[PDB]
Design a binder for this molecule. Structure first.
Ligand SMILES: Nc1ncnc2c1ncn2[C@@H]1O[C@H](COP(=O)(O)O)[C@@H](O)[C@H]1O[C@@H]1O[C@H](COP(=O)(O)O)[C@@H](O)[C@H]1O
Lengths: 577, 518, 414
């Protein structure tokens, strides 16, 4: 069921491998409707670790402009990619290369897009498919322009944020990477640059298939293998302990005292072994399997695993030829996995670790379903109803803005609205705290229902919160609303709404109160900007003009205090009345 | 859902510092003197071990505000402190700490004890060191005390102490019960190592090792072989079948740990080790999920604080202008009864939250949650004056303890620490009077000043005695005037019938009557 | 006004007189329903059921304006928020009748404003006590003794309104040959003092007692045995001196106070003397934040029919002697913060028929409570519904009534 799971046929794998070798000599492969693009691999010391970068782990913050919608929606932080691979991407993107022109021509004819490569030639291909995904898939999602990316033994290139963003966009299914059981090409990047700088050029020269690849100094190969293995073991142990582990202050202390690679596996790695084939989707379990599979078994195996990996760097031909002739097992769908991992050679500790990762994924989806069920309960909808149908309409009838009524009033209504706002804020802060610690699926922000509910909650409740905040004179105790005191639930809802509307707020009372007092020329410019923002808000619906344009509104009083010249200049005169 | 002790041990072993500290200690042992050097960006303070030692066993010379003299003084050995004084390493590290950010103190046996004591002195200071301090001492004696261990525990510095002990090492095992362990102790073996953070678990492991017949006199070579094989263990894996592998994750992990430390799974002592490993990890609900339930409970309690605020506003709006503190002191309306209900509910909720914070069912950074700090601050500003008003109402005349001298809930202390954790307040001039009094003990100090003034008017007729009393009241009234000028007190303090106004009038009359003005 | 007279005529004397005497209560102050039925029984000898029927008869008329009826939960539930409001014109109609002045009788007496200036009857001792069965004295700070002699040859009902502080007991009680009703109310903002309590102690035929915001006199043997008294209600009265009087057993002096009522009172350090009585039938300690433990020596009160609690946060939980009363039929426990794991243990409390808990922190109940076969009328709160269902499974007579809490600002005003 490998073809059913990945959507890639074995003949396409054969074509990908053939094009990969051919491109060794951006090679296009017009094979029917499928257009196979193969990038030429390179074996140089600067290729894996960019000299410009100073950190022990070559990384650079991905520019939001070139890579929109890869940053985490929460916390507003971008992921990290290898600097040299990004330089290769930008070099290929150049119009003189005409690679992007060829891709555009192929897409205009609705031809299938396939990106392939081996080692370096592959790592880049993955970047280029991500680039094409953000170029065309996100704007108009469609089946015909859906690309495919198959690569053999590529070094890890994405961070944890990159994997989270890939999963959130549901683009991880288009990625399938073939990795041999013994191959140091994908495992090298999980190591400190200085720890391997001594023997890196030698092993890179030996690994070059185009090169003679002979006269290999076992000593140097063994040292490089030992350093890479040690670093990968440290990274994997730290990751598994962080994900599910006790003594968190202990890990925090050594994390303050240590430096570990942040790059994490991304996509759907498929492992290869003479006995059977195995494919996994869990990113954390991918690193665990990567470390455990390449572990030594006996003294006869030792000093041969380095040599075995060196030869298996170019042994993917036999795997492609015998891909159909090997049993396929989907690790995620498989219930009993002990026998499969024993065939893979993974020790008991690795089996338990990957099982714990699968269980933690099950717990994450269970928490998602529990939150969904809690949201579906009628009581929360009733509580929203109360606010939108008893408090606000009564305030409209009382000729007082519900915000202004919230400020000064004695009616129980106000107390009931306060209680409802507190109850809603508690649940929304619960959900926000669950989302902060990544205890909810990466796609929990994705579905339109939750973001719509959060936007409605913000637009309905946030004026009440600011009314409470300014009424108690906390602005003169800590500061303005925007500087401090803004709950991050509303900020997260605004971020989600902005991200949703990027492809195809309601806190104006804050700055309105800020403008109160100390009138100046800069203030009146802010008044004009406010007026424009209020117009575009009532166009959007974040704030409602009629409940704000009342005679008893605080905005109305502030405008009355405003000099008559800005009043004459403003266009909202007729609307205010 | 897994016995992470083995995972933590593997993480600590895979760290380059595990080998770097051993190399530094060996180099120091060869040198025989204090070794200061920088390897891989980390500096190691390598104190050579002293052969002769007698660890038989407030401090004018030693500066350790972490000893917790309030609790039974920790019995620190005479030898360790006398060595720390006599090697004069203080001047050395002060001239070596300049411009350093990360340091890993290293030691062995008595050298390890020296390193541990030096680090403990480093963190136990009024200001924490800028450079991060870690301890990698191995073979150090078990010297210490229960009071010292618990002081490090509440100081949250136990994690900074990491120690590796062999299964055949007797130097730490051969110690009195008065020496209580602290920090993280790891029982490394030939097959593998296990980390034990709980002091009781470490004590039980020490006891079972004492009952075990371990005979290895030359512990230094054992330590060298152990660090070598542990550094080179990650290269070669094993079956790790553990005989009959249990289906349960907990039992399988415990059996793996027992096999890693050398003891057989079916061994009687191996079975005891299995039981103690099972009891090592506490089985409670995940702290992250409990944080959300605490958030929901805070949301549920919030309307009670809304109603107490409404009561305070109504009392302020009252025509009597007596003051909500005085209104609560003179409870004659059912409003006072129900507001006492609300305040007792808030007190119960916050006491539960603080107690659970102390017991560690919550993330360690719960205090750094920002929102919780602000909620605690609001609660303290809206509740504590009423609590002290109730206490004073129930306070007999003979009860002179007041609120400053004891009789203060510990929840308020913890809240005060949490507000100590906030940013520097902006010194913006308040346009109007503050909604709530910034000082949470102002009313109690006002009551004490009222008692002092009453004593002055019914005693100390002696002009000088009265003069000293006047000297006592004048700084407090100056403080109150400054608070008024900055508008850090609500309208209740400025109320015509408020206790503060009556006290000020009595002060003015007394000043006129003695003629103490100017 | 004419329609008021017509309605009074429509009501037969059994109810007409009851109303007329009910209109003699302070117009501004509210009237407790229990006090109203008490005076109605002690005056017109109507049974309690007849008094309730007459209350309904007035209720259908617009003259009566009841505050509320949350006691509807069960008949066992005592009078709750049942204060009634009347019209001043209705009291003016009683004045327009001038029954006392017209007949020169000491019955149907009323003086508005509670002015210190006593009436022309007190003046020159013109108080012709032809018949004094009905007595409503409204006073402020004037001498309670008045300025005349009130022998009260036939006075079964008497009330007294007052204010200020340091009041004295009028000698009219001692002069009174017989009397069954005594009501004193202090409208001041501070507890009121009373002097010369022996005047009220002269008579031994009193049957009802009701005081509010007054320092209660000590419960020594100076008071003549009141073998006809059956009701005692205390409101906003510090009983520090009068209580802890277990030296004088209340039952041993007199069978008085068969039912006891305490509300909004503090300083109740102990309760041994309260449980030392043997003639007690109902107890209700409410709005008392000064109770920590109900004494285990409650076996003396074995005829206790109902025990009701409304506000006591310091009380840790119910004792184990709760399930030792074969007469306990109604129990109320609400608004008690410290009630975690309420030890009802209602295995031997089968007499309990109705259980109400508007709001509670109950966290656990013994299986014995499920054994209770008479756990009907369960007015439970929103929480603890699973446990009511568990009891429902074993005993389907639960008759559960989930309580939805409401929030108002009416508590903010007085
Ligand atoms: N000076 C202050 N005092 C008390 N709490 C503060 C505060 N400043 C900020 N906060 C609260 O602290 C929380 C911090 O944000 P977050 O929950 O996302 O970590 C916000 O919910 C914020 O709520 C803001 O405070 C207002 C009152 O909070 P409560 O209703 O909980 O008393 C809210 O209306 C909202 O604007």
């Amino acid at each position: 069921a490998f073809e059913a799971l990945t959507g890639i046929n074995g003949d396409l794998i054969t074509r990908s491998w053939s094009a990969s070798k051919q491109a060794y000599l951006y090679h296009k492969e017009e094979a029917g409707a499928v257009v196979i693009f193969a990038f030429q691999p390179s074996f140089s010391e600067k290729d894996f670790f960019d000299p410009d970068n100073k950190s022990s782990f070559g990384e650079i913050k991905l520019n939001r402009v070139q890579f929109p919608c890869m940053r985490k929606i929460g916390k507003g932080d971008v992921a990290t990619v290898n600097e040299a691979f990004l330089k290769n991407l930008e070099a290929i993107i150049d119009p003189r290369t005409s690679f992007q022109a060829s891709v555009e021509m192929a897409v205009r004819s609705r031809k299938q897009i396939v990106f392939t490569g081996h080692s370096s030639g592959g790592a880049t291909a993955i970047l280029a498919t991500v680039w094409y995904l953000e170029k065309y898939f996100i704007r108009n999602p469609n089946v015909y322009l859906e690309p495919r990316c198959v690569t053999f033994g590529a070094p890890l290139v994405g961070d944890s944020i990159f994997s989270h963003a890939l999963g959130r966009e549901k683009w991880s299914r288009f990625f399938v990477n073939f990795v041999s059981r013994f191959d140091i090409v994908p495992r090298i990047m999980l190591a400190r640059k200085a720890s391997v700088e001594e023997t890196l050029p030698h092993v890179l020269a030996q690994l070059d298939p185009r090169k003679s690849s002979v006269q290999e100094s076992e000593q140097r190969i063994t040292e490089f293998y030992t350093r890479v293995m040690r670093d990968t073991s440290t990274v994997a142990n730290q990751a598994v302990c962080e994900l599910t582990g006790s003594a968190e202050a202990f890990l925090e202390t050594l994390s303050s005292f240590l430096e570990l690679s942040p790059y994490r596996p991304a996509g759907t790695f498929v492992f290869s072994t003479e006995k059977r084939l195995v494919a996994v989707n869990n990113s954390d379990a991918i690193l665990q399997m990567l470390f455990y599979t390449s572990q030594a078994s006996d003294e006869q195996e030792w000093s041969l695993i380095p040599f075995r990996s060196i030869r298996d760097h170019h042994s993917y031909e036999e795997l492609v030829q015998s891909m159909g002739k090997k049993l396929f097992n989907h690790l995620d769908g498989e219930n009993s996995i002990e026998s499969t991992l024993n065939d893979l050679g993974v020790s008991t500790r690795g089996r338990q670790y990957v099982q714990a990762a699968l269980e933690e994924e099950k717990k994450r989806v269970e928490n998602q379903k529990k939150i969904i069920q809690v949201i579906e309960q009628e009581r929360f909808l009733k509580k929203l109803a109360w606010i939108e149908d008893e408090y606000k309409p009564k305030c409209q009838a009382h000729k007082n803005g519900y915000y202004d009524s919230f400020k000064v009033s004695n009616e129980e209504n106000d107390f009931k609205a306060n209680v409802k706002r507190a109850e809603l804020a508690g649940v929304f802060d619960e959900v926000l705290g669950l989302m902060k610690k990544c205890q909810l699926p990466d796609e929990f922000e994705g579905d339109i229902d939750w973001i719509k509910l959060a936007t409605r909650y913000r637009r309905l409740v946030e004026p009440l919160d600011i009314a409470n905040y300014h009424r108690h004179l906390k602005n003169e105790d800590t500061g303005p609303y925007m500087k401090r005191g803004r709950p991050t639930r509303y900020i997260y809802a605004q971020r989600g709404y902005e991200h949703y509307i990027l492809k195809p707020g309601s806190c104006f009372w804050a700055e309105v109160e800020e403008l109160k007092g100390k009138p100046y020329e800069e203030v009146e410019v802010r008044v004009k900007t406010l007026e424009g923002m209020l117009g575009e808000w009532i166009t959007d619906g974040e704030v409602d003009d009629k409940e704000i344009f009342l005679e008893g509104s605080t905005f109305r009083k502030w405008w009355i205090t405003l000099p008559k010249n800005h009043k004459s200049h403003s266009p909202l005169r007729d609307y205010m009345m | 859902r897994f016995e992470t002790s083995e995972l933590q041990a593997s993480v600590m072993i895979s760290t380059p510092l595990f080998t770097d500290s051993w190399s530094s200690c060996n180099t120091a042992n060869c040198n025989g003197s204090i070794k200061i050097h920088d390897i891989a960006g980390i500096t190691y303070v390598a104190i050579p071990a002293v052969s002769m030692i007698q660890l038989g066993n407030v401090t004018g010379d030693v500066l350790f505000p972490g000893l917790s003299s309030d609790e039974p003084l920790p019995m620190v050995d005479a030898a360790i402190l006398k060595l720390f004084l006599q090697l004069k390493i203080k001047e050395g590290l002060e001239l070596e700490l300049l411009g350093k950010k990360l340091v890993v103190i290293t030691g062995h046996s008595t050298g390890g004890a020296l390193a541990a004591f030096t680090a403990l002195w480093l963190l136990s200071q009024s200001s924490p060191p800028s450079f991060r301090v870690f301890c990698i001492t191995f073979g150090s004696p078990l010297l210490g005390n229960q009071s010292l261990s618990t002081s490090i525990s509440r100081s949250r510095l136990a994690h900074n102490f990491c120690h590796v002990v062999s299964i055949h090492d007797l130097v730490p095992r051969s110690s009195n019960e008065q020496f209580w362990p602290f920090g993280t102790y790891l029982f490394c073996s030939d097959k593998g190592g296990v980390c034990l953070d709980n002091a009781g678990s470490v004590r039980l492991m020490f006891n079972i090792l004492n009952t075990t017949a371990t005979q290895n006199t030359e512990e230094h070579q054992r330590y060298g072989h152990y660090v070598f094989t542990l550094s080179h263990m990650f290269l070669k894996s094993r079956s790790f079948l553990g005989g009959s592998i249990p289906d349960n994750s907990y039992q399988a992990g415990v059996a793996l740990a027992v096999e890693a430390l050398g003891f057989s799974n079916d061994d009687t002592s191996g079975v005891l080790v299995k039981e103690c490993i099972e009891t090592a990890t506490r089985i409670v609900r995940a702290p992250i999920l409990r944080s959300a339930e605490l958030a929901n409970e805070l949301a549920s309690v919030l309307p009670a604080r809304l109603e107490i605020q409404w009561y305070k506003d109504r009392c302020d709006a009252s025509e009597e202008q007596l003051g909500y503190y005085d209104f609560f002191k003179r409870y004659s309306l059912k409003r006072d009864f129900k507001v006492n209900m609300s305040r007792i509910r808030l007190a119960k909720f916050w006491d539960t939250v603080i107690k659970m914070v102390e017991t560690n069912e919550l993330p360690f950074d719960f205090h750094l949650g920002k929102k919780w700090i602000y909620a605690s601050q609001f609660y303290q500003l809206l509740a504590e004056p009423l609590d002290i008003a109730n206490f004073y109402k129930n306070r007999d005349i003979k009860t002179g303890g007041h609120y400053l001298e004891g009789n203060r809930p510990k929840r308020y202390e913890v809240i005060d620490k949490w507000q100590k954790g906030v940013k520097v307040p902006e010194e913006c001039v308040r346009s109007r009077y503050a909604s709530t009094t910034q000082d949470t003990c102002f009313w109690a100090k006002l009551e004490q000043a009222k008692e002092w003034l009453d004593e002055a008017r019914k005693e100390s007729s002696d002009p000088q005695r009265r003069s000293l009393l006047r000297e006592k009241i004048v700084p407090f009234e100056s403080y109150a005037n400054t608070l008024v000028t900055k508008k850090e007190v609500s309208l209740d303090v400025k109320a015509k019938n408020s206790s503060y106004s009556v006290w000020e009038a009595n002060l003015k009359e007394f000043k006129c009557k003695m003629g103490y003005e100017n | 006004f004419a329609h008021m007279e017509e309605s009074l005529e429509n009501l037969d004397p059994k109810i007409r007189d009851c109303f007329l005497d009910m209109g003699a209560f302070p117009e501004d102050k509210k009237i407790p329903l229990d006090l109203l039925t008490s005076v109605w029984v002690e005056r017109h000898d109507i049974d309690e059921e007849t008094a309730f029927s007459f209350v309904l008869r007035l209720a259908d008329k617009n003259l009566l304006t009841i505050v509320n009826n949350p006691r509807f939960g069960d008949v066992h539930i005592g009078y709750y928020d049942v204060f009634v409001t009347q019209h001043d014109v209705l009291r003016d109609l009683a004045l327009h009748m001038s029954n006392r002045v017209d007949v020169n009788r000491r019955e149907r007496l009323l003086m508005p404003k509670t002015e210190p200036v006593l009436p022309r009857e007190w003046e020159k001792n013109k108080d012709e006590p032809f018949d004094a069965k009905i007595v409503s004295l409204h006073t402020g700070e004037m001498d309670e003794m008045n300025w005349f002699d009130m022998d009260l040859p036939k006075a079964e009902v008497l009330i007294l309104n007052f204010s200020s502080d340091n009041y004295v007991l009028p000698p009219f009680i001692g002069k009174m040959s017989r009397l069954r009703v005594l009501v004193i109310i202090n409208n001041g903002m501070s507890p009121a003092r009373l002097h010369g309590f022996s005047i009220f102690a002269n008579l031994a035929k009193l049957r009802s007692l009701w005081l509010k915001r007054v320092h209660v006199p000590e419960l020594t043997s100076c008071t003549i045995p009141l073998k006809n008294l059956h009701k005692i209600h205390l409101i906003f009265c510090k009983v520090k001196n009068s209580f802890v009087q277990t030296s004088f057993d209340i039952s041993k002096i007199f069978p008085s106070l068969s039912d006891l009522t305490i509300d909004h009172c503090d300083d109740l350090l102990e309760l041994k003397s309260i449980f030392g009585i043997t003639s007690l039938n109902s107890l209700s300690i409410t709005n008392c934040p000064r109770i920590l433990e109900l004494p285990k020596n409650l076996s003396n009160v074995q005829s206790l029919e109902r025990l009701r609690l409304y506000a006591c946060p310091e009380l840790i939980s119910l004792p184990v002697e709760v399930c030792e009363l074969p007469c306990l039929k109604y129990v109320d426990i609400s608004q008690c913060v410290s009630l975690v794991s309420l030890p009802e243990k209602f295995g031997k409390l089968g007499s309990l028929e109705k259980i109400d808990m508007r709001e509670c922190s109950l966290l656990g109940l013994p299986s014995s409570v499920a054994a209770l076969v008479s756990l009907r009328h369960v007015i439970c709160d929103e929480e603890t519904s699973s446990m009511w269902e568990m009891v429902k499974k074993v005993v389907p007579e639960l008759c559960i009534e989930v309580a939805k809490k409401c929030f108002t600002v009416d508590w903010l005003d007085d």
